[PDB]
Write a protein that binds this ligand. Structure first.
Ligand code: BCL
Ligand code: BPH
Ligand code: BPH
Ligand code: BPH
Ligand code: MW9
Ligand code: MW9
Ligand code: MW9
Ligand code: SPN
Ligand code: SPN
Ligand code: SPN
Ligand code: SPN
Ligand code: SPN
Ligand code: FE
Lengths: 44, 273, 76, 255, 325, 51, 51, 44, 44, 51, 51, 44, 51, 44
């Protein structure tokens, strides 16, 4: 397997799964925030 | 009184003129032929300054002012109260400065050193002689020199710069200011580096030149070295004083208009559409 | 070969002086012609001290040095 | 904005606070520079009555590298010379001294050396810092004129020998000394010249400080591969003393 | 004449130095790759590189390049995207601070909003370069003198751009980003508040700047005159006094009656240089907030000179006599 | 899209976490300043005018 | 989400804690100062004009 | 297990619990303060 | 083969195949964005 | 066209990924600023004008 | 909360005590001066107007 | 068993107890001061 | 509370005493000057008024 | 036992006992001074 960092396939898979769980939480909050600002003050 | 290691260096010889007639010390000071001429000139100049202060009417160090003559006197001699004392004091100051340099030369010769310090001091003498002798002679009157007063020689600087409207636009003044700022940044860096090498945190050993070279290549990717930094500092300082003399000698005898207008050659170059 | 470099910089200084006088005959002022003269000096004199002084003498020495650099690569 | 009393406002308070701070800083700076050469002495080696207006500083310690120990300053003078061939020219203080024998051989005046440690200076790895080029892996002349093989001319116009090697500082990549092999007519062995005292030309190398007859008395190193600090000081001071002692016309007034 | 030691006679080159290391493992973040310049080597060292890349340096470089491009692109757009005119008027263009009517609130992007966004990126860049200078000493196990000297200049930087505008109540008090426009700011600042010559802290700053330049002429010249005794190896002279330090001290002792030591002259240099921006910033912070006319302040505190003669050209000459008619 | 986890077999996971945090703050800071440079979207000024 | 603890397997707590303290104080000070530069939200002028 | 700092999995589980305990207290105080500011002087 | 990076042919095919799948996602979002903006405000 | 994968036998992916990322963000920010610098495509002024 | 004592297993008390002292005094001085700079909360001027 | 400063667990408990005593004293004094100030001149 | 003496096990008394002395004198001088700057609490001008 | 300064427990106890005696005397003098000033020219 090609590896520049030193991690293995399982380790990378696990790190990625926790990283994507935080991407979605941050992004879901951003979606709710953006939806409330348009109902208050529409742009577009 | 001598330092613990000074006695073996106090030998006879190495004088330009005077032999052993003036070859001795007074306290820590060395006297020679040029030590007797410096004392005479400096004492005469100071006594005349204070006599002029007494005749002016104030002894306040902030308010003492001895001024050059009117422009109507030209290059002749004025009455001693209307600007002649300034001329005499100028002659005395030139003599004192030249004697100081020639005394440093003899000290260097006696210690077996190079003559770099008197050569460096000659540059500061050249900037002063340009301000009180060269520009005034070219412009045609001794009244173009600056007055001898702590707060009155700043009025001269202010009025002389606004006589060319916006002095910041003088091309050779911009070069001189850059040299001054660069010398101060380099002196700060050099002092900091040496002190940080010699004074580590408590409980650590001292460092060497390898460590100093490494810190600076890590910080900015280059290191001038322990010998290059002194050459560069000297060259920067001497370039600062030379360009200062140029900025003042062109302002009067070479250019008459405002300094912004001088830039017109760039704004109307034929290449521009 | 620091003596060929100084020669090349002096030919640049001389070309700069000639650029000033030539633009002045054609209608430009001194300072306009002298800015162009300074650039002729710095660009051309610099270019000639890299190119001419970099054609250093060596004759079969040049050859072997190059044929051996061509052996470093091939296994690099 | 208001004043506290009279004409005293915030700017005046700031100015006087800076005055006080600057006075304390001047005291600290002057006291910090008195860790060498004190207490003062008279011209007979006794402690002088006057010691000046500033008292002496407290002690600092330096932890040296490579197991050389500790240095505490201010302390005793360990670089002091013992028996100097000098003579007073007056009964009081303030007059010069006269050499008793040969000033250049006795190390007095502009030829004076300081008693430094009898070991070479080390680099970061604990190795001697200055090494002859014939033993320095990877070094070569990259610019300038190479002086090896050229004859050396003295200050009076005599050829005394040939340059055989160069001694370089490998950490800083700089030439420090030139090594000269003497002709039999002008002495025997090898000598060193510091780089700052030579002018290298296309056909010769010029040393103006000393004459040919002075080249046999240059101090010699013990080992052919390393030089200690004491030997460095004695070699450099010998060349420096020739600027005044080589000829009697160099010592008299030039007028 | 004797050799003077301004240019090296012969250069020698060997394997490139990669630097010292300790338990902090500085090698891991250093770039590989070096060069050599024989033109520079006539004066100093010839080796170029390598450099250390931490996070502080990377952040500083990125945020400083952003500031530069917001200014440069604003300057380019002010001229109509005309490259030849952009070159013609480069020294005259600037990114102007906001108008006085907006106070400390956020101004329109056309009237100072881009100036505030770019100022926040320059701030971040400068504070990051300082954290790098502190970390490298800590990693190298040296003193923190360099970081303190840098913070001395950062003090005046922050006074000019951040503190004084806040205490005055307007973002319009800041300096524009331009070559000529920033020099016009200096002259206008001096004119608006009387005469800046009569500010005592301005005079103290000038005193320390003059003193710092006089000291590098003296120190550089003194060190170059004792290089025939090994005087450029200063640290070993500190650890073991030699004849170079003795002669250097005795020159100044016989010249002006007192001298320094090899270690102690660098403290003098460090303090004079450091004291210039501190006094300058204290002087700038007092203007407008406390004192509004420095010449009237000098008249109040009695250090303003008085002149007896009259004003006017016809008190000294005639218009016809000045023309030769 | 199902093999995007191999980004961690190229980039170190500490280097990425520092850069992403710093970038995200500075981007959120700048957007709030752009909204407040306006008239329609400055909420502090709209509370005063609805009064 | 229940494995966010592993953030301490990558980041050193010392540096994170120091940076967090400095960041939090600076942010709070900045927010308190913008409110005072507005008219409707300065609490000192409000008390002055209420009496 | 992958670990760059040097801590072990159990040490990291204990530190994160304490850190979250502090974060909630901070956020719980910040919430009550925002509600009072809104009843006192409402934005939006 | 010629490799200046020390990767093999298949490892290169693996990296490329993954890279293009993110390139296509980036390009797709950008086209939906440009379309919404031309309908919102044409520039031709 | 089918042999384009070989760029990864010439160029190191680690360097080009960082280079790309920086290049991409800087290009996007410049277009938005040019758009914001125009009188017809400044979407913040349209919201104020439209209503 | 019972385990907040373990802050001292990360931070050196010597540094944080000095930092806390300097921070507290500077903050208190700044607040007192800000109060003195207003019109409704200057207590020296209130006595002059109540007398 | 984790430690970055060299202290043990029991020393840390003892330091924290003293620190909390000081903090509570300071906070109580500040609370009384703020109460007196609010009674003298209100801000809300 | 009864174990505050251990503050001398963390801090050096020699530095603390000098810092204290300087701080206390500067604070007292500043307070006296601030009182002198006002119109109701200047005791030199009240003596002149009451005569 | 923890000590960053080199003193022992008993020496610290004695030093603090001496220090608080001076602190209380300074505080008492300041309290008496502050009382007379209020009776002559009140500030609240
Ligand atoms: C009409 C003109 C006015 C005048 C108006 C002013 C004003 C206004 C000011 C000065 C100030 C100064 N004046 Mg004045 N001054 C006048 C006449 C003079 C004369 C004279 C006639 O000979 C002299 C010698 C001086 C000299 C001086 C200096 C002593 C002083 C600047 C201090 C300093 O540290 O500078 C060095 C500069 C700095 C330290 C700036 C800080 C730089 C920062 C740290 C850079 C950060 C990095 C950067 C962003 C990155 C760049 C990119 C890199 C390549 C990566 N003035 C007249 C009276 N003067 C200043 C001062 O302090 O006033 C008291 C000041 O503000
Ligand atoms: C006030 C001091 C200023 C300074 C000076 C400075 N920096 C330098 C140099 C100098 C004199 C270099 O010579 C060296 C360099 O090689 O620059 C291209 C360098 C450098 N300073 C850098 C960084 C840097 N310096 C900074 C600051 C500063 N350094 C200030 C502006 C900063 C910031 C923002 O504060 C940064 C980020 C890099 C640009 C560079 C790091 C050197 C490096 O990485 O070298 C790698 C080696 C190479 C192979 C490149 C050399 C180029 C040639 C192909 C080699 C052959 C030489 C040739 C004969 C001559 C060309 C060299 C010229 C520089 C003369
Ligand atoms: C690159 C040039 C820099 C420089 C170099 C320089 N100056 C030097 C040296 C060097 C290398 C010395 O070795 C030498 C020295 O010994 O320094 C300790 C010196 C020196 N330069 C000095 C000062 C000085 N240098 C200055 C600047 C500079 N000198 C430059 C920045 C300045 C200013 C204005 O910036 C000053 C004030 C002296 C401290 C010193 C030695 C001068 C000296 O002692 O001369 C002998 C004379 C007397 C003791 C008294 C003479 C009395 C006169 C007869 C009467 C006074 C008249 C005077 C004109 C009145 C002026 C009134 C003002 C209010 C206007
Ligand atoms: C004690 C006061 C003096 C002083 C000291 C001083 N300055 C200092 C320091 C110190 C002690 C540093 O440690 C620090 C330093 O790094 O020095 C090498 C510095 C420094 N002082 C500087 C400038 C400076 N100092 C000045 C003044 C002074 N500094 C005083 C004279 C002045 C002026 C106006 O006189 C200037 C202009 C910088 C060189 C440096 C601070 C570096 C810094 O913070 O950089 C931030 C970087 C960016 C803007 C990002 C990079 C973006 C660039 C626009 C382009 C890319 C970089 C590239 C290398 C440059 C372009 C060259 C190309 C060929 C590639
Ligand atoms: C008012 C008095 C001076 C007269 C007025 C006219 C001149 C004014 C200008 C400059 C004054 C410099 C005079 C210095 C002459 C020194 C003579 C000398 O040699 O004095 C020594 C004693 O001095 C020293 O040791 C050095 C003194 C400091 C040098 C000057 C510093 C200039 C710093 C800053 C720049 C100054 C600008 C102002 C900033 C305003 C700031 C608000 C005796 O010998 P010693 O053996 O060294 O004794 C000591 C020790 O060893 C004990 O043992
Ligand atoms: C020849 C004609 C003269 C030219 C005429 C022009 C007039 C002006 C020129 C020069 C004035 C300087 C004159 C003073 C020189 C005295 C000679 C000297 O120094 O003689 C020493 C005797 O010492 C002294 O007489 C001590 C002098 C004390 C210096 C004051 C220190 C701070 C001073 C300044 C701080 C500055 C800050 C700001 C300032 C504002 C605030 C001041 C013999 O020494 P020694 O026997 O080897 O040993 C003994 C040694 O250790 C110490 O006692
Ligand atoms: C402001 C920008 C940052 C804001 C966002 C930060 C939080 C975002 C989230 C995470 C990143 C935080 C750091 C966590 C990691 C800590 C430890 C670590 O690892 O990284 C550290 C962390 O470095 C940083 O976080 C850099 C931040 C620099 C910002 C400075 C800007 C100026 C400050 C203020 C200006 C404004 C005030 C004006 C008014 C007042 C007037 C001034 C470096 O250590 P290192 O050892 O070099 O790291 C190499 C590594 O690989 C070792 O393994
Ligand atoms: C100038 O133009 C204007 C003003 C108009 C603009 O504003 C222009 C703006 C842009 C052009 C903006 C562009 C913006 C972007 C491209 C934004 C992109 C943003 C993201 C991709 C954000 C990603 C965020 C991800 C987050 C928050 C992830 C968090 C993850 C975690 C907290 C979990 C991590 C923990 C792990 C992995 C532990 C596991 C460890 C082990 C050891 C197993
Ligand atoms: C108007 O717009 C402008 C620009 C003005 C803005 O204001 C914009 C503002 C923003 C964009 C703001 C953004 C703000 C954030 C993203 C804020 C985030 C804040 C947090 C995540 C805060 C976290 C706080 C956490 C706290 C306080 C934790 C405390 C923890 C502890 C006290 C416990 C410590 C742990 C120990 C001791 C462990 C010990 C264990 C051992 C094993 C030793
Ligand atoms: C209006 O808006 C503006 C901007 C003006 C503001 O003012 C905004 C202001 C803020 C945002 C302010 C924010 C303020 C804070 C967050 C303040 C926080 C304060 C604290 C955490 C205070 C803590 C105080 C703790 C104290 C006083 C502890 C004291 C301890 C001791 C006195 C001694 C105990 C220790 C000993 C003896 C050591 C024992 C030794 C052993 C070996 C066992
Ligand atoms: C109104 O707004 C403005 C800004 C104007 C203000 O004025 C605001 C002001 C403040 C915010 C002020 C705040 C002030 C403080 C917090 C002040 C604190 C003061 C103290 C804690 C003072 C302590 C004094 C202690 C003293 C005097 C103790 C001892 C003195 C001794 C002489 C005894 C010492 C001797 C010893 C220990 C001998 C050694 C013993 C051995 C056994 C060896
Ligand atoms: C378009 O072409 C390209 C792409 C090549 C370019 O990018 C070209 C770029 C140029 C041609 C750029 C030219 C740039 C200049 C000529 C720049 C000149 C800059 C100066 C002289 C700057 C001086 C700056 C500052 C001064 C004098 C003092 C103090 C400043 C500050 C402290 C700034 C800090 C600001 C703060 C803290 C406020 C931030 C606001 C907050 C709310 C936090
Ligand atoms: Fe030096």
């Amino acid at each position: 397997d090609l590896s520049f960092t030193g991690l293995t396939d399982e380790q990378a898979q696990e790190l990625h799964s926790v990283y994507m769980s935080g991407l979605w939480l941050f992004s879901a909050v951003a979606v709710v925030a953006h939806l409330a600002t348009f109902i208050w003050r529409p742009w577009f | 009184a001598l330092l613990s290691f000074e006695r073996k260096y106090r030998v006879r010889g190495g004088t330009l003129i005077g032999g052993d007639l003036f070859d001795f010390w007074v306290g820590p000071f060395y006297v020679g032929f040029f030590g007797v001429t410096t004392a005479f000139f400096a004492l005469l100049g100071t006594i005349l300054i204070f006599w002029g202060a007494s005749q002016q009417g104030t002894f306040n160090p902030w308010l003492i002012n001895i001024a050059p003559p009117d422009l109507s006197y030209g290059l002749g001699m004025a009455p001693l109260m209307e600007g002649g004392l300034w001329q005499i004091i100028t002659i005395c100051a030139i003599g004192a400065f030249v004697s100081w340099a020639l005394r440093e030369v003899e000290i260097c010769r006696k210690l077996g050193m190079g003559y770099h310090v008197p050569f460096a001091f000659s540059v500061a003498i050249f900037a002063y002689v340009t301000l009180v002798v060269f520009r005034p002679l070219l412009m045609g009157a001794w009244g173009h020199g600056f007055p001898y007063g702590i707060w009155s020689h700043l009025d001269w600087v202010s009025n002389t710069g606004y006589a060319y409207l916006h002095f910041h636009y003088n091309p050779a003044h911009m070069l001189a200011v850059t040299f001054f700022f660069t010398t101060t940044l380099a002196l700060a860096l050099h002092g900091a580096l040496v002190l940080s090498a010699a004074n580590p945190p408590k409980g650590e050993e001292v460092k060497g030149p390898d460590n100093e070279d490494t810190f600076f290549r890590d910080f900015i990717g280059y290191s001038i070295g322990t010998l290059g930094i002194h050459r560069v500092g000297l060259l920067l300082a001497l370039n600062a004083g030379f360009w200062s003399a140029v900025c003042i000698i062109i302002s009067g005898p070479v250019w008459t208009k405002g300094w912004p207008e001088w830039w017109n050659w760039w704004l109307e170059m034929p290449i521009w559409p | 070969d620091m003596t060929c470099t100084i020669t090349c910089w002096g030919i640049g200084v001389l070309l700069g002086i000639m650029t000033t006088v030539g633009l002045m005959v054609v209608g430009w002022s001194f300072l306009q012609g002298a800015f162009m003269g300074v650039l002729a000096w710095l660009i051309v004199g610099g270019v000639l001290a890299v190119a001419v002084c970099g054609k250093d003498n060596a004759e079969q020495i040049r050859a072997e040095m190059a044929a051996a650099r061509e052996r470093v690569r091939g296994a690099t | 904005e208001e004043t506290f009393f009279g004409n005293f406002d915030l700017a005046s308070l700031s100015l006087w606070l800076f005055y006080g701070f600057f006075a304390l800083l001047i005291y600290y700076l002057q006291t910090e520079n008195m860790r060498e050469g004190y207490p003062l002495e008279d011209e007979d080696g006794n402690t002088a009555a006057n010691q000046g207006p500033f008292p002496l500083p407290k002690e600092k310690t330096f932890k040296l590298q490579h197991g050389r120990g500790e240095l505490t300053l201010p302390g005793e003078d360990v670089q002091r010379r013992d028996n100097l061939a000098l003579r007073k020219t007056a009964h009081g203080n303030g007059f010069p001294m006269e050499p008793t024998g040969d000033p250049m051989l006795d190390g007095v005046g502009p030829a004076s050396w300081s008693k430094r440690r009898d070991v070479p200076e080390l680099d970061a790895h604990g190795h001697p810092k200055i090494v002859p080029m014939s033993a320095a892996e990877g070094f070569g002349v990259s610019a300038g004129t190479d002086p090896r093989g050229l004859p050396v001319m003295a200050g009076d116009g005599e050829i005394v020998g040939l340059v055989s090697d160069m001694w370089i500082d490998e950490a800083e990549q700089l030439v420090r000394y030139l090594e000269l092999e003497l002709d039999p007519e002008w002495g025997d062995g090898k000598r060193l010249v510091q780089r700052q005292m030579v002018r290298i030309k296309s056909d010769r190398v010029k040393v103006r400080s000393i004459y040919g007859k002075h080249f046999k008395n240059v101090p010699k190193t013990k080992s052919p591969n390393q030089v200690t600090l004491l030997e460095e000081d004695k070699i450099m001071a010998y060349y420096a003393g020739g600027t005044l002692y080589a000829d009697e016309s160099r010592l008299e007034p030039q007028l | 004449p004797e050799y003077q030691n301004i240019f090296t006679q012969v250069q020698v080159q060997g394997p490139a130095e990669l630097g010292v290391d300790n338990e902090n493992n500085l090698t891991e973040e250093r770039t590989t790759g070096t060069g050599f310049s024989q033109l520079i080597g006539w004066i100093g060292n010839a080796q170029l590189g390598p450099i250390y890349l931490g996070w502080f340096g990377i952040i500083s470089l990125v945020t400083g390049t952003l500031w530069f491009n917001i200014v440069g692109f604003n300057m380019l757009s002010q001229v109509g995207y005309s490259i030849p005119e952009f070159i013609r008027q480069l020294f005259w263009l600037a990114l102007e601070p906001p108008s006085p009517e907006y106070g400390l609130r956020m101004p329109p992007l056309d009237d100072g909003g881009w100036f505030i966004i770019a100022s926040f990126f320059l701030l971040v860049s400068v504070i990051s370069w300082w954290l790098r200078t502190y970390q490298l000493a800590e990693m190298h196990k040296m003193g923190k003198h360099v970081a303190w000297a840098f913070a001395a200049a950062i003090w005046l930087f922050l006074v000019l751009g951040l503190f004084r505008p806040i205490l005055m109540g307007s973002w319009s008090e800041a300096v524009p980003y331009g070559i000529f426009p920033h020099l016009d700011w200096t002259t206008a600042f001096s004119i608006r508040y009387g005469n800046l010559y009569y500010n005592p802290f301005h005079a103290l700053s000038i005193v320390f700047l003059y003193g710092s330049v006089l000291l590098f002429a003296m120190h550089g010249a003194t060190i170059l005159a004792v290089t025939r005794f090994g005087g450029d190896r200063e640290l070993e002279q500190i650890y073991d006094r030699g004849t170079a330090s003795e002669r250097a001290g005795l020159f100044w002792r016989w010249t002006m009656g007192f001298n320094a030591t090899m270690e102690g002259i660098h403290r003098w240099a460090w303090w004079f240089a450091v004291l210039t921006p501190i006094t300058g910033g204290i002087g700038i912070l007092l203007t407008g907030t406390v004192v509004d006319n420095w010449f009237l302040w000098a008249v109040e505190h009695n250090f303003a000179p008085d002149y007896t003669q009259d004003y006017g050209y016809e008190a000294y000459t005639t218009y016809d006599g000045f023309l030769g008619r | 899209m199902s093999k995007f986890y191999k980004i961690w077999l190229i980039f170190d996971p500490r280097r990425v976490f520092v850069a992403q945090g710093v970038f995200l703050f500075l981007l959120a800071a700048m957007i709030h300043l752009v909204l407040l440079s306006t008239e329609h979207f400055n909420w502090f000024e709209l509370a005063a005018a609805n009064a």
